[PDB]
Design an enzyme around this catalytic site. Structure first.
Site, PDB file in Angstrom:
ATOM      1  N   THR A 198       3.771 -10.999  10.879  1.00 54.51           N
ATOM      2  CA  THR A 198       4.653 -11.897   9.848  1.00 54.51           C
ATOM      3  C   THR A 198       4.183 -13.587  10.419  1.00 54.51           C
ATOM      4  O   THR A 198       4.420 -13.794  11.583  1.00 54.51           O
ATOM      5  CB  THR A 198       5.850 -11.435   9.922  1.00 54.51           C
ATOM      6  OG1 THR A 198       5.048  -9.601   9.427  1.00 54.51           O
ATOM      7  CG2 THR A 198       6.755 -12.062   8.830  1.00 54.51           C
TER       8      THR A 198
ATOM      9  N   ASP B 147       3.502  -6.665  14.249  1.00 56.53           N
ATOM     10  CA  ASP B 147       4.049  -7.102  13.946  1.00 56.53           C
ATOM     11  C   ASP B 147       6.055  -6.661  13.576  1.00 56.53           C
ATOM     12  O   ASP B 147       7.015  -6.413  12.434  1.00 56.53           O
ATOM     13  CB  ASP B 147       3.466  -6.502  12.314  1.00 56.53           C
ATOM     14  CG  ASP B 147       4.487  -7.826  10.560  1.00 56.53           C
ATOM     15  OD1 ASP B 147       4.562  -8.597  10.803  1.00 56.53           O
ATOM     16  OD2 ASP B 147       4.381  -6.992   9.708  1.00 56.53           O
TER      17      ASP B 147
ATOM     18  N   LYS C 205       9.311  -7.278  14.318  1.00 57.06           N
ATOM     19  CA  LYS C 205      10.165  -8.161  13.548  1.00 57.06           C
ATOM     20  C   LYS C 205      12.136  -7.126  13.340  1.00 57.06           C
ATOM     21  O   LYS C 205      11.601  -6.689  12.697  1.00 57.06           O
ATOM     22  CB  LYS C 205       9.814  -9.062  12.026  1.00 57.06           C
ATOM     23  CG  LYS C 205       9.425  -8.338  11.129  1.00 57.06           C
ATOM     24  CD  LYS C 205       8.192  -8.504  10.065  1.00 57.06           C
ATOM     25  CE  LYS C 205       7.641  -7.637   9.252  1.00 57.06           C
ATOM     26  NZ  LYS C 205       7.009  -8.032   7.635  1.00 57.06           N
TER      27      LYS C 205
ATOM     28  N   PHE D 268       0.731  -1.218  -0.654  1.00 57.35           N
ATOM     29  CA  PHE D 268      -0.261  -0.208   0.377  1.00 57.35           C
ATOM     30  C   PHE D 268       0.866   0.898   0.149  1.00 57.35           C
ATOM     31  O   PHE D 268      -0.081   2.389   0.362  1.00 57.35           O
ATOM     32  CB  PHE D 268      -1.045  -0.083   1.033  1.00 57.35           C
ATOM     33  CG  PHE D 268      -1.846  -1.357   1.063  1.00 57.35           C
ATOM     34  CD1 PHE D 268      -1.693  -2.158   1.935  1.00 57.35           C
ATOM     35  CD2 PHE D 268      -2.870  -1.916   0.250  1.00 57.35           C
ATOM     36  CE1 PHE D 268      -2.423  -3.470   1.938  1.00 57.35           C
ATOM     37  CE2 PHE D 268      -3.839  -2.551   0.267  1.00 57.35           C
ATOM     38  CZ  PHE D 268      -3.029  -3.505   1.369  1.00 57.35           C
TER      39      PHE D 268
ATOM     40  N   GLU E 113      13.010  -7.484  10.294  1.00 57.34           N
ATOM     41  CA  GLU E 113      12.732  -6.608   9.244  1.00 57.34           C
ATOM     42  C   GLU E 113      12.095  -4.602   9.255  1.00 57.34           C
ATOM     43  O   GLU E 113      12.408  -4.354   8.711  1.00 57.34           O
ATOM     44  CB  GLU E 113      11.960  -7.055   8.183  1.00 57.34           C
ATOM     45  CG  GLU E 113      13.008  -8.777   7.779  1.00 57.34           C
ATOM     46  CD  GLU E 113      12.052  -9.433   8.577  1.00 57.34           C
ATOM     47  OE1 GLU E 113      12.066  -9.474   9.577  1.00 57.34           O
ATOM     48  OE2 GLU E 113      13.003 -10.914   7.629  1.00 57.34           O
ATOM     49  N   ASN E 114      11.500  -4.819  10.704  1.00 57.92           N
ATOM     50  CA  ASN E 114      10.979  -3.860  10.835  1.00 57.92           C
ATOM     51  C   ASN E 114      11.548  -2.213  11.771  1.00 57.92           C
ATOM     52  O   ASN E 114      11.133  -1.622  12.623  1.00 57.92           O
ATOM     53  CB  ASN E 114       9.037  -4.229  12.019  1.00 57.92           C
ATOM     54  CG  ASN E 114       8.088  -4.092  10.717  1.00 57.92           C
ATOM     55  OD1 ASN E 114       6.965  -4.752  10.510  1.00 57.92           O
ATOM     56  ND2 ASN E 114       8.525  -3.877   9.499  1.00 57.92           N
TER      57      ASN E 114
ATOM     58  N   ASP F 248       6.726   1.068  10.953  1.00 53.85           N
ATOM     59  CA  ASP F 248       6.037   0.073  10.459  1.00 53.85           C
ATOM     60  C   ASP F 248       4.596   0.118  11.464  1.00 53.85           C
ATOM     61  O   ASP F 248       4.457  -0.581  11.562  1.00 53.85           O
ATOM     62  CB  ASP F 248       6.148  -0.956   9.706  1.00 53.85           C
ATOM     63  CG  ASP F 248       5.234  -1.936   8.738  1.00 53.85           C
ATOM     64  OD1 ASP F 248       4.492  -0.806   8.831  1.00 53.85           O
ATOM     65  OD2 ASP F 248       5.218  -2.712   8.230  1.00 53.85           O
TER      66      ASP F 248
HETATM   67  N1  LIG Z   1       7.439   0.175   5.934  1.00 54.31           N
HETATM   68  C1  LIG Z   1       8.122   1.548   6.085  1.00 54.31           C
HETATM   69  O1  LIG Z   1       7.239   2.164   7.040  1.00 54.31           O
HETATM   70  C2  LIG Z   1       9.575   1.702   5.697  1.00 54.31           C
HETATM   71  N2  LIG Z   1       9.807   1.241   5.071  1.00 54.31           N
HETATM   72  N3  LIG Z   1      11.118   1.809   4.605  1.00 54.31           N
HETATM   73  C3  LIG Z   1      11.953   1.124   4.101  1.00 54.31           C
HETATM   74  C4  LIG Z   1      11.720  -0.447   4.201  1.00 54.31           C
HETATM   75  C5  LIG Z   1      12.234  -0.617   6.033  1.00 54.31           C
HETATM   76  C6  LIG Z   1      13.152  -2.054   5.744  1.00 54.31           C
HETATM   77  N4  LIG Z   1      12.255  -3.181   5.805  1.00 54.31           N
HETATM   78  C7  LIG Z   1      11.970  -2.631   3.956  1.00 54.31           C
HETATM   79  C8  LIG Z   1      11.560  -1.532   3.539  1.00 54.31           C
HETATM   80  C9  LIG Z   1      11.193   2.717   5.883  1.00 54.31           C
HETATM   81  C10 LIG Z   1       9.940   2.496   6.574  1.00 54.31           C
HETATM   82  C11 LIG Z   1       9.830   3.286   7.643  1.00 54.31           C
HETATM   83  C12 LIG Z   1      11.074   4.867   7.555  1.00 54.31           C
HETATM   84  C13 LIG Z   1      12.175   4.547   6.975  1.00 54.31           C
HETATM   85  C14 LIG Z   1      13.331   5.140   7.238  1.00 54.31           C
HETATM   86  N5  LIG Z   1      14.743   5.136   6.522  1.00 54.31           N
HETATM   87  C15 LIG Z   1      14.620   3.464   6.153  1.00 54.31           C
HETATM   88  N6  LIG Z   1      16.081   3.231   5.997  1.00 54.31           N
HETATM   89  C16 LIG Z   1      16.399   1.999   5.132  1.00 54.31           C
HETATM   90  C17 LIG Z   1      17.944   2.579   4.671  1.00 54.31           C
HETATM   91  C18 LIG Z   1      18.457   1.354   3.690  1.00 54.31           C
HETATM   92  C19 LIG Z   1      17.739   0.419   3.469  1.00 54.31           C
HETATM   93  C20 LIG Z   1      16.336  -0.026   3.079  1.00 54.31           C
HETATM   94  C21 LIG Z   1      15.634   0.820   4.748  1.00 54.31           C
HETATM   95  N7  LIG Z   1      13.267   2.849   5.567  1.00 54.31           N
HETATM   96  C22 LIG Z   1      12.010   3.268   6.307  1.00 54.31           C
END
Ligand SMILES: NC(=O)c1nn(CC2CCNCC2)c2c1CCc1cnc(N=C3C=CCC=C3)nc1-2
Ligand SMILES: NC(=O)c1nn(CC2CCNCC2)c2c1CCc1cnc(N=C3C=CCC=C3)nc1-2
Lengths: 279, 279
Positions: A165, A133, A135, A21, A137-138, A151
């Protein structure tokens, strides 16, 4: 308030992530040179997929968070088609990336990062918000290698519906369609295990088979697993949600932070401590 | 919004400054370990001294600023007697302290810090806000040695009354009881002179005698004064406010930032550049 920002106030750069989304893009604000992670959402798609409550909740939760271990919402705006959320940019990406890079964390690193996560959860649960959620990854890492939890789309504000997840799903979500602070504490137990073992505790060929292992508490500890960390995990991965260390029925974060695994932790100012180098 | 903070959310520490209408205290937020400079104002005293408009304006201006070279307002609250403004804490204190510590700035350091101030003013004047009391005492240094401009109590939001610190007062304030963006540019000229010479340009035994030198443009440059910096100062310390480099009548910040003194400056991302070491 500063006047509403617009897309034209930013030079957009690379895509940091692509969700179902939303898309997160790295942007540099022209007037300041500051980098933000801008989460971009298409109003039409959110409406089509009945996600207005979730996007609304995401914005509302993030607006309530003011703690160093969480993503910050700096600004919002919209144009005719899209919503834009200006978030802190965590330059080092996913914790999962480091687990994979070094295989598993030594004890010092496991303790420090587990302490940051517990301290973040204490803050979050104190506000009556549950993540749902959680994990690796978050859980992001900033430039200084402190965590920033992200997230909040699927968060729940305490006053069924969503299951996160598969590998981090607590048994009560599978058995009673119900979530609570204790569901996050289950996910914490899985994450600690993953830090130490290199892999999450419940693993199988597909979701059904994973869910099956979760409800039977079917996992084991590898031989070398730090004994006090094993004891903590055994106190979090408990099928009965009311017996998990850290939950209200177990008298909260006091006893969790008092666990022997955290003996040398100074809980007061973790974000100002220098993180241990990852091997 | 996060729920309103209260004095009991903080451990207050040392006093950073004591003004006529406020006291700034260093405070550590208990929940986060974050340090803020909390400006504390007594409602009774503000009312007695007819300062409600000034305190109101101070809060309103700071709420509008979102730029790395300015103090940030993070939160406000009040109790029965006092208003509390939560501000960014600039750990290294006044620019004036460094001028005194090293005597005067070399050319590289003069250029870099003058560039930060000009870039901050471009931002501020673009919002139609004028500072009106710019001086090295109000220009703070953060932990990374970038500037943070403070003290917006006497600011004016463009749509007489206030005259700031004697040594930095522009001639039009003395001759016409009138302020504009150009009054800040005069103060900038005085500050550049002070960086290079070690002392402000107009100095005398008392205020009357200072004001007298200002309106007669009675100051001189010491021998070693960086030639291009001297040329820039001569373009800012101009009695006619409409002929000062940087003002709207001189076509704004473009020509000011184009001055030969700034030839090697990259204006785009000063806050992400490493500042030159002060001798
Ligand atoms: N879904 C989110 O809110 C979100 N998604 N990302 C990108 C990746 C984060 C890790 N998992 C897959 C999606 C972010 C955020 C919050 C805000 C946010 C802030 N900084 C980063 N930084 C990254 C740096 C290097 C690689 C990926 C992300 N990323 C995000
Ligand atoms: N008047 C103010 O708004 C103000 N006053 N101070 C304290 C001193 C600043 C320099 N001139 C005398 C008063 C502050 C602020 C803004 C907010 C602010 C943020 N950080 C600092 N940091 C200091 C660090 C060391 C010594 C003094 C101040 N100070 C302030």
């Amino acid at each position: 308030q500063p006047r509403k920002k617009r897309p034209e106030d930013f030079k957009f750069g690379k895509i940091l992530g692509e969700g179902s989304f939303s898309t997160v893009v790295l942007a540099r604000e022209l007037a300041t040179s500051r980098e933000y992670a801008i989460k971009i959402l298409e109003k039409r798609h959110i409406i089509k997929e009945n996600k207005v409550p979730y996007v609304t909740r995401e914005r509302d939760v993030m607006s309530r968070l003011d703690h160093p271990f969480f993503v910050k919402l700096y600004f919002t705006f919209q144009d005719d088609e899209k919503l834009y959320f200006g978030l802190s940019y965590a330059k080092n990406g996913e914790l999962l990336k480091y687990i994979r890079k070094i295989g598993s964390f030594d004890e010092t690193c496991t303790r420090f990062y587990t302490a940051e996560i517990v301290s973040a959860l204490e803050y979050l649960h104190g506000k009556g918000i549950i993540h749902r959620d959680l994990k690796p990854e978050n859980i992001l890492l900033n430039e200084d290698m402190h965590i920033q939890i992200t997230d909040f789309g699927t968060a729940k504000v305490l006053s069924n519906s969503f299951v996160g997840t598969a590998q981090y799903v607590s048994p009560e979500l599978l058995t009673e369609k119900s979530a609570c602070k204790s569901s996050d504490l289950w996910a914490l137990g899985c994450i600690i295990y993953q830090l130490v073992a290199g892999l999450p505790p419940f693993r199988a060929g597909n979701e059904y088979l994973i869910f099956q292992k979760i409800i039977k508490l079917e996992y084991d500890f590898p031989e070398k697993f730090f004994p006090k960390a094993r004891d903590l995990v055994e106190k979090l991965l408990v099928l009965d949600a009311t017996k998990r260390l850290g939950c209200e029925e177990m008298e909260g974060y006091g006893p969790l932070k008092a666990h022997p695994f955290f003996e040398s932790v100074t809980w007061e100012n973790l974000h100002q401590q220098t993180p241990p180098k990852l091997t």
